[PDB]
Design a protein around this ligand. Structure first.
Ligand SMILES: Nc1ncnc2c1ncn2[C@@H]1O[C@H](C[C@@H](N)CC[C@H](N)C(=O)O)[C@@H](O)[C@H]1O
Ligand SMILES: CN1CCC(=C2c3ccccc3C=Cc3cc(O)ccc32)CC1
Length: 247
């Protein structure tokens, strides 16, 4: 008669609900559940695509049927995959899972600008932040000045994610914050694949180790002598030389 399906993504998120006649995740009581197995976007989905998800908490799962408590408020989300020229339908609507785990402040790395910090203590392998952005080609990134590529992150062999000016200011764009994490060759985080209900296929920032509250989150940007683009910044030259001096 009735059938509830739990789909687990490799990144730890999941989709749960009763499948329709065609075995599709289509209905008004479908939920995406974030990797903490607690934070959920609950509501209207069509074939697994979020049409109207409301912020909710997964309280329990008695005999496979999940119980969701809607969060007080009007926080509503929808599938909203970026394009080459549009980063988001609501650039100032933050992600609720990210908002519990990270914040932006002045970096502790000299002259690095702003950085990304842990709000709370978390264990290893914890998804902390999402790296959404516009979707451009490797050709575009490779064919321009590398000074324009400080917020680029390759998604796959076809697509590079970017957060271009003016979206590099949190007052202009705070829907995701992964671009605010600075580089280190002793990083405490990595970039990892992520299938997001709002952003679609993107990258996330995942901890490599346990992190304390208010620790700066860092990721290795790469190990090449120079970043993609035309005509490396010296801060990276200095850190790369120090990295290579250890071996
Ligand atoms: N280890 C570092 N030392 C100095 N500057 C850094 C370092 N890591 C990142 N940056 C700076 O941060 C840019 C990369 C951004 N994705 C990071 C967020 C940036 N700090 C901001 O305030 O928006 C680089 O192009 C540099 O300007
Ligand atoms: C999250 N992304 C941020 C930008 C980034 C850069 C880069 C770009 C501009 C200026 C500086 C950098 C720094 C290092 C780097 C090294 C590589 O071997 C490949 C790419 C990069 C890749 C990761």
């Amino acid at each position: 008669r009735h059938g509830v399906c739990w789909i687990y993504y490799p990144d730890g998120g999941s989709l749960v609900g009763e499948v329709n006649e065609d075995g599709e995740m289509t209905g008004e009581k479908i939920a995406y559940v974030y990797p903490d197995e607690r934070t959920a976007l609950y509501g209207k989905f069509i074939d697994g695509e979020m049409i109207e998800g409301k912020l909710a908490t997964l309280m329990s799962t008695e005999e496979g049927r999940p119980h969701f408590e809607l969060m007080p408020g009007n926080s509503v989300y929808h599938f909203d995959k970026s394009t080459s020229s549009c980063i988001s339908t609501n650039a100032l609507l933050p992600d609720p899972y990210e908002s519990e785990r990270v914040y932006v402040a002045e970096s502790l790395i000299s002259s690095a600008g702003e950085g990304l910090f842990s709000k709370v203590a978390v264990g290893p392998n914890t998804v902390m932040s999402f790296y959404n952005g516009v979707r451009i080609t490797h050709q575009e990134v490779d064919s321009r000045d590398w000074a324009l590529n400080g917020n680029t992150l390759s998604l796959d062999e076809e697509t590079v994610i970017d957060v271009p000016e003016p979206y590099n200011h949190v007052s202009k764009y705070c829907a995701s914050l992964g671009h605010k994490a600075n580089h280190s060759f002793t990083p405490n985080c990595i970039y990892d694949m992520f299938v997001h209900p709002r952003f679609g296929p993107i990258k996330c920032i995942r901890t490599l180790r346990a992190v304390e509250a208010d620790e700066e989150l860092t990721v290795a940007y790469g190990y090449d002598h120079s970043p993609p683009g035309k005509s490396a910044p010296e801060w990276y030259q200095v850190e790369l030389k120090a990295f290579q001096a250890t071996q």
